[PDB]
Design an enzyme around this catalytic site. Structure first.
Site, PDB file in Angstrom:
ATOM      1  N   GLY F  20       0.808  -1.213   0.000  1.00  0.00           N
ATOM      2  CA  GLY F  20       0.000   0.000   0.000  1.00  0.00           C
ATOM      3  C   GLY F  20       0.842   1.264   0.000  1.00  0.00           C
ATOM      4  O   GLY F  20       0.520   2.248  -0.687  1.00  0.00           O
ATOM      5  N   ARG F  43       1.141  10.565  -8.740  1.00  0.00           N
ATOM      6  CA  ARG F  43       0.518  10.681  -7.408  1.00  0.00           C
ATOM      7  C   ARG F  43       1.440  10.190  -6.294  1.00  0.00           C
ATOM      8  O   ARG F  43       0.981   9.693  -5.256  1.00  0.00           O
ATOM      9  CB  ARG F  43      -0.815   9.939  -7.348  1.00  0.00           C
ATOM     10  CG  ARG F  43      -1.813  10.430  -8.375  1.00  0.00           C
ATOM     11  CD  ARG F  43      -3.049   9.561  -8.407  1.00  0.00           C
ATOM     12  NE  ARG F  43      -4.082  10.174  -9.231  1.00  0.00           N
ATOM     13  CZ  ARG F  43      -5.076  10.910  -8.746  1.00  0.00           C
ATOM     14  NH1 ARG F  43      -5.189  11.120  -7.435  1.00  0.00           N
ATOM     15  NH2 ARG F  43      -5.955  11.442  -9.578  1.00  0.00           N
ATOM     16  N   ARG F  87       0.905  -9.529  -2.993  1.00  0.00           N
ATOM     17  CA  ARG F  87       0.671  -8.374  -2.143  1.00  0.00           C
ATOM     18  C   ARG F  87       1.134  -8.654  -0.722  1.00  0.00           C
ATOM     19  O   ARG F  87       0.787  -9.691  -0.138  1.00  0.00           O
ATOM     20  CB  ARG F  87      -0.810  -7.996  -2.137  1.00  0.00           C
ATOM     21  CG  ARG F  87      -1.057  -6.561  -1.719  1.00  0.00           C
ATOM     22  CD  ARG F  87      -1.954  -6.448  -0.529  1.00  0.00           C
ATOM     23  NE  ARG F  87      -1.617  -5.219   0.207  1.00  0.00           N
ATOM     24  CZ  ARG F  87      -2.189  -4.770   1.309  1.00  0.00           C
ATOM     25  NH1 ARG F  87      -3.198  -5.455   1.864  1.00  0.00           N
ATOM     26  NH2 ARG F  87      -1.743  -3.640   1.838  1.00  0.00           N
ATOM     27  N   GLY F  89       1.650  -6.509   3.194  1.00  0.00           N
ATOM     28  CA  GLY F  89       1.256  -5.343   3.953  1.00  0.00           C
ATOM     29  C   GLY F  89       0.986  -5.753   5.384  1.00  0.00           C
ATOM     30  O   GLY F  89       1.234  -6.894   5.770  1.00  0.00           O
ATOM     31  N   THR F  90       0.478  -4.822   6.182  1.00  0.00           N
ATOM     32  CA  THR F  90       0.212  -5.143   7.575  1.00  0.00           C
ATOM     33  C   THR F  90      -1.267  -5.475   7.768  1.00  0.00           C
ATOM     34  O   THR F  90      -2.076  -5.367   6.849  1.00  0.00           O
ATOM     35  CB  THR F  90       0.659  -3.990   8.483  1.00  0.00           C
ATOM     36  OG1 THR F  90      -0.044  -2.790   8.134  1.00  0.00           O
ATOM     37  CG2 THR F  90       2.150  -3.757   8.317  1.00  0.00           C
ATOM     38  N   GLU F 179      -7.715  -6.196   7.171  1.00  0.00           N
ATOM     39  CA  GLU F 179      -6.983  -5.215   6.370  1.00  0.00           C
ATOM     40  C   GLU F 179      -7.991  -4.628   5.380  1.00  0.00           C
ATOM     41  O   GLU F 179      -9.209  -4.734   5.570  1.00  0.00           O
ATOM     42  CB  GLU F 179      -5.734  -5.856   5.731  1.00  0.00           C
ATOM     43  CG  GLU F 179      -6.002  -7.176   4.996  1.00  0.00           C
ATOM     44  CD  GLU F 179      -6.678  -6.942   3.654  1.00  0.00           C
ATOM     45  OE1 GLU F 179      -6.014  -6.399   2.738  1.00  0.00           O
ATOM     46  OE2 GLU F 179      -7.883  -7.252   3.544  1.00  0.00           O
ATOM     47  N   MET F 180      -7.518  -4.001   4.301  1.00  0.00           N
ATOM     48  CA  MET F 180      -8.418  -3.201   3.477  1.00  0.00           C
ATOM     49  C   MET F 180      -8.253  -3.365   1.956  1.00  0.00           C
ATOM     50  O   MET F 180      -8.833  -2.570   1.201  1.00  0.00           O
ATOM     51  CB  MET F 180      -8.262  -1.715   3.858  1.00  0.00           C
ATOM     52  CG  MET F 180      -8.537  -1.408   5.315  1.00  0.00           C
ATOM     53  SD  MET F 180      -8.483   0.344   5.849  1.00  0.00           S
ATOM     54  CE  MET F 180      -9.754   1.107   4.823  1.00  0.00           C
ATOM     55  N   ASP F 204      -0.506  -5.156  14.788  1.00  0.00           N
ATOM     56  CA  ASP F 204      -1.453  -4.687  15.794  1.00  0.00           C
ATOM     57  C   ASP F 204      -2.435  -5.822  16.082  1.00  0.00           C
ATOM     58  O   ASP F 204      -2.891  -6.487  15.148  1.00  0.00           O
ATOM     59  CB  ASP F 204      -2.226  -3.446  15.313  1.00  0.00           C
ATOM     60  CG  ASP F 204      -1.337  -2.216  15.115  1.00  0.00           C
ATOM     61  OD1 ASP F 204      -1.284  -1.370  16.033  1.00  0.00           O
ATOM     62  OD2 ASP F 204      -0.707  -2.076  14.036  1.00  0.00           O
TER      63      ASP F 204
END
Lengths: 233, 233, 233, 233, 233, 233
Positions: F20, F43, F87, F89-90, F179-180, F204
């Site tokens: 991300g 961006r 992918r 990520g956290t 996650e998202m 977390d």
């Protein structure tokens, strides 16, 4: 001829009794019908054609739940030209208006299934029985001395409910029992311009938490069988 | 007494006829009742009590749509102690088979409203009439030789449909007309344990585009009125 | 002409004030207009045309609920060529930010209805008024020394709510009051490319339970009437 | 013992094979198990326990559809302490990546059922197998010389689909075939913290309409059965 | 301080401009602000604090999509005390009525997201801006001779839509453009009692067909930038 | 070449690693990628191309949330011809089956997004990774001595959740962490015939509230990085 029924076209009379349990379908053939022969046996889902009081009548098992019921009701109509379907079985009463051994005529089948939203524009299909057939049930019941309980049932995809906290709200809205097939029966008969009815025998009451002993279940179910056979003769 | 009805408690008989149009209420009151008295007039929504062949009967206007209809029957039941409710309204045909001015009895009221999902666990509530009321409407029309069509109607929030392309599928699932109140009436009487039924005479035709007339909907349905009065006496 | 309005073509001015109650409509024609003419009266839903400060204004009642409001403003726009629709009514206040006699301009109308999803791809249609109309009201309300409150209203299908627990949540998200029409009015004006805005008079506060005597109600309401007519003039 | 299983406690081994058809459960007991014993027979829905290469293995039928499947999985896990559930059955292929005979490992099961929305906060539950069972399947398939096809299946509430136009979209999104139980099996194993996998033998191909001889069926379905037993051993 | 913002409490001004593109944020800093310090840079998502013609103002990037925008807007309001949020992005025109360089003010943001159903009782939240902000924008654009198109926007979870066939429908309900964040901005601002406005500069016409370069985020369109800076002072 | 990526076609190898945070991407390029060259920077969303152990590898940032993720992997696949997307990520742990520093392989990604319903017939799309990619992950982790935790994740549109009460139920249904993006990546790759897998490092614990310090986050993330590059070489 269908993937789920191996009967030949014409083996089914245009009136058909439906049960979930093929072992019960077998019982009704040997005990209450004359000249009864097995016309189908796929997946051990038995079906029979025979005679009651001189009249031709067919019997068919349909397994448990809306998906299973829809498969067999669909094939009976579109392939075997069955025109009246009467289903009889047990439920779990959730209303104080009914108690054990009562028989419920479902004039409405609410549901938590998405099948009728799929069928019907993602709106609310009020899944109902053919009126005339319910009039035959009411009148036959009266002649046979049965006080029919009339109202809605709730057809669930779940035997083990995750919403037992909602049973009082279902009873509030005139849901007398829970079973698992009538919304599919009713929607399928609606889809295909056929006449359907569902009768419930209170074998268990899920509010009071009482049930019938195995002896009384057989005698309670016998009285619903006679009702069915009498309104189709 | 309530924000919408003007009556003293006791002004309503336990049997009440409902229309959406206050003028039809007023027309039935003048032509068919004896001893008619106006009991409510909030928002020009009139109600009346009187006698019909010796028996008390009330009339109530209930406006257009599920929301408005739900306001008035809720109040009739909870505050004014009405027990039986008989809507006699107008609908649009969606099958060319159904003529114009035919009287339909609604055995079930499908809907595109969210109200029953909101009322009923976001499941499918099968909105249905009380069966003894429907039986008395079937037997009475037979006695009178009126000829009554029986099936589901579709209660919409839209008089002007955004889904005309779906009328055939509604007709295929035994929907005889579209109106806008029956799901509301049925749901509210199920919520509050009262007895309700919907009859409606075909006023519009959504395929061949016949209509109708504002005054013509006030008069011109006398058969439907008599049948409803007859079944309430 | 249309099923629900019996005015002649051209009877309506392009600007129209709306209220649910046809008795307040008639009240505005009596007390506030010049050359007031009655132009429609199907179902006692009264409509008028007149002049205010030399300028033509039509009045039209539209009943209760999204379904009924949608019927009338659809016909007003498509058949009778109404371009601007200013709705005024009472509401149940739901936010600490508003007190009795406050006039709310609804810049958005949320809903528990399924009508906008039916209109709009089963997605979330944000139902909003015409910006120029809302500008005119703010400016007119300013010039008149009216402390105009701006925010969302919640347009509900239920007068007797089954979710009073949610009222705090609504007010959290800037819903200043609950009524039953705005979402249909905005959705229909958006569909048909017309200008609409809704103004609501706080007659009751549903949370703090405070209310207005009928004398303060026909006085508070008159202040809004003057506001509506000043912006139409 | 339960409403659907009359086996004694301890009759079921902790590893169990699942089919819809009780005739295939019987077929496997006779053909591939040593000293198999029929342990349940309610509703003609048979179950067995036998041995394969000296290791205990149980078999159970479960009918058609997510509703019937969930009943049997729920009782096996809760009442009979089964820890590993391997479903072997047939499906309707819809992808060009799979021919007939082919065995599909369902790494996910999409569905049109509402059951997982009811279970799961009305969100999208991604119903998936236990990964270590899927790994055992992959590895065992390699040692048996079977090219295992891996991907999603679509678990439909319908055998007779009202959405045949969507099959191309379904296959595009890596659905190799349609069946009627995997989504129910997987959500119940997930709900109850039990390990589950579904293997599907391509009997019909709904796109090519190619449908293989009844004899290549038993020869190919035997390869699936053998794969199931080798990984349960 | 928060998981996504590097800044010290008190670094932001109470008024903040928002962009999805952190580089456009950086462009605004160097070209329109003096004394501009970069105050955050987590995940390269740059924010600044500087003076516009002697007037304090902050700038923050918020990434792409409703969920991204919501993260940043939530932290700015709750932690960093931003009170007024004015987003200035790009969007896609869905009509020949709207040109490539046009500036749109979103008076409602519809969405195909579920976030507002999750937030708002599974009903329809009409996501709207603070009205006082929309007035300043309107009045400032009039002052500067900058023509502002005003209407709804459609906030999509898809940049590459799966429903291009529905663009005409969106256009019909006064949806001037498609973008991807405004419904989240509005619903978050409503949630937290903050003031938000979204202005959009057309960069692509989705029907007519032209497309802007990543590089062309300049003169081109700093008119939108001047508008935002002018009304925020 | 695309609105969000200014690389040339041919600048991306067909295997690409995603995170991300483009700064995490930047950290991976300067510590692990040989001959690393920056290939895009629209961006501030950096991507890179280089070699790992002789094998061509690209890196790409994709932002936060399903919408943002969907934008970039769509463009990577249809414009730049990426075939495999891995992918990392956290995530925030919700299950007691995982603790901090654990690496989770997501074999399914449930979601509260509507995006998969919009894509997939408004049914339940079971968003899953490519099974071979997940096998490589499993085998690679074993070679590196990594105890890989395997299960479902919940991809939410909300970093700041409104249904924290539901975490227990998600864990019960074998969701290890929230996650998202995973459901967007999985659905986008299913849509476009590509191979995707998501790995998450627990930084977390949302139940117990334990959390890694910034130093521990980095060390932990390095481990997942090496796992990712080893299965890609």
């Amino acid at each position: 001829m269908t993937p789920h029924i191996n009967a030949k076209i014409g083996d089914f009379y245009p009136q058909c009794l439906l049960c979930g349990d093929p072992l019960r379908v077998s019982y009704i053939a040997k005990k209450f019908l004359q000249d009864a022969k097995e016309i189908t046996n796929v997946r051990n889902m038995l079906g029979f054609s025979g005679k009651y009081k001189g009249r031709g009548i067919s019997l068919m098992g349909h397994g448990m739940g809306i998906a299973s019921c829809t498969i067999y009701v669909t094939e009976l109509i579109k392939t075997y030209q069955v025109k009246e379907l009467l289903r009889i079985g047990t439920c779990g009463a959730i209303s104080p208006k009914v108690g054990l051994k009562d028989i419920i005529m479902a004039t409405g089948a609410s549901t938590d299934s998405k099948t009728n939203r799929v069928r019907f524009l993602n709106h609310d299909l009020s899944a109902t029985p053919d009126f005339e057939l319910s009039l035959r049930a009411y009148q036959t019941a009266k002649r046979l001395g049965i006080d029919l309980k009339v109202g809605n049932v709730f057809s669930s995809d779940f035997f083990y409910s995750f919403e037992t906290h909602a049973f009082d709200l279902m009873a509030k809205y005139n849901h007398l029992a829970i079973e698992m097939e009538a919304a599919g029966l009713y929607a399928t008969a609606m889809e295909l311009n056929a006449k359907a009815l569902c009768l419930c025998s209170v074998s268990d009451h899920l509010i009071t938490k009482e049930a019938l002993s195995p002896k009384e279940r057989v005698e309670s179910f016998d009285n619903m069988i006679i009702l069915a056979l009498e309104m189709m003769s």
